[PDB]
Ligand binder design. Structure first.
Ligand code: A2G
Ligand code: A2G
Ligand code: A2G
Ligand code: A2G
Ligand code: A2G
Ligand code: A1AAJ
Lengths: 150, 150
């Protein structure tokens, strides 16, 4: 099961549960932060071809739009939650370098900066540009891309 | 280990070894053809993250640029060959729906038609357009996409 870091391409910061817990509470926000440690490692659980659950490795909780909205509007915050259902399905587009939700919007840093400060929230947004690009890299070498689908 | 059909998206035809043999000779051309059977099933052997070998399931031979050059020119024919080496590396881009060789060109039907006739050759070409799109589908449901990387 590949373990990887979700690296914001423009800044080199990574996706974290806010606070960096090895067992974040349900609805903990997902933020960007420069630190690397085992509590910001992720896995991907395939459900249906490209679609699956982005899983926080330390806790097992997965990435949700807050409230579990089926078609989340722009600026809906991303959180971790233990529930599994179809409204938490994403795809890890390692060719265009983005993360897309089942209803078609992407994970962004809130406000869309190419250099978001530590603790910047992540949100859903439909726009496509350099500041929403992410790559999926080895915990052993933050420049080495790894295949999240195996 | 997923077995799949390589489906030309605009026409619905599939990638075949010319002649449909369970053991095509080395340098057998890869063509498009409407038929479905076990001698046009493929598998994908991952080598390095997105890069891997496109493997003819019945024979074990893989897709090569004819002549095995590292940086083949436009209109280089695609063939099957037993050899394994780094000039036979491709990625299966199931987000943009194409097949890309390590040096950057794509698999095309020769001449670029959206509805090529049976037996049309495939070739490498750098252009991107609707007639070089491919999707990767179940041998049991040719309209169901399947994940080729697992
Ligand atoms: C000291 C410590 O554990 N720090 C972590 C930090 O590494 C990062 O995970 C951050 C994300 O909100 O949360 C915590 O502050
Ligand atoms: C009952 C219900 O809708 N539960 C969901 C839960 O499954 C998860 O999606 C969460 C994310 O914030 O939002 C909701 O509370
Ligand atoms: C115009 C502008 O600044 N747009 C970006 C938008 O593209 C998206 O990244 C969003 C995420 O919160 O933040 C900004 O609004
Ligand atoms: C008998 C017959 O037509 N069978 C096959 C056909 O199914 C297809 O694989 C084709 C590819 O060139 O090769 C043969 O014509
Ligand atoms: C060693 C050798 O024969 N060289 C290559 C072979 O490995 C394969 O790439 C082939 C494809 O047409 O082209 C060449 O013949
Ligand atoms: C639709 C079209 O005009 N296609 C071009 C190239 O883009 C390429 O497809 C090539 C492959 O042989 O055939 C044509 O020259």
């Amino acid at each position: 099961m590949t373990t990887f870091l979700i690296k914001h391409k423009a800044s080199g910061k990574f996706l974290h549960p806010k606070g960096g817990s090895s067992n974040p509470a349900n609805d903990t926000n997902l933020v960007l932060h420069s630190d690397i440690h085992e509590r910001m490692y992720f896995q991907f659980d395939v459900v249906d071809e490209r679609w699956g659950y982005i899983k926080h490795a330390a806790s097992g909780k997965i990435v949700h739009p807050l409230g579990g909205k089926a078609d989340p509007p722009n600026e809906t915050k991303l959180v971790l939650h233990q529930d599994r259902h179809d409204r938490a399905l994403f795809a890890m587009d390692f060719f265009n370098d983005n993360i897309i939700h089942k209803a078609g919007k992407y994970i962004h840093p809130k406000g869309g900066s190419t250099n978001p400060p530590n603790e910047t929230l992540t949100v859903m947004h439909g726009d496509k540009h350099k500041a929403m690009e992410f790559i999926f890299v080895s915990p052993k070498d933050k420049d080495k891309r790894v295949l999240v689908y195996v």
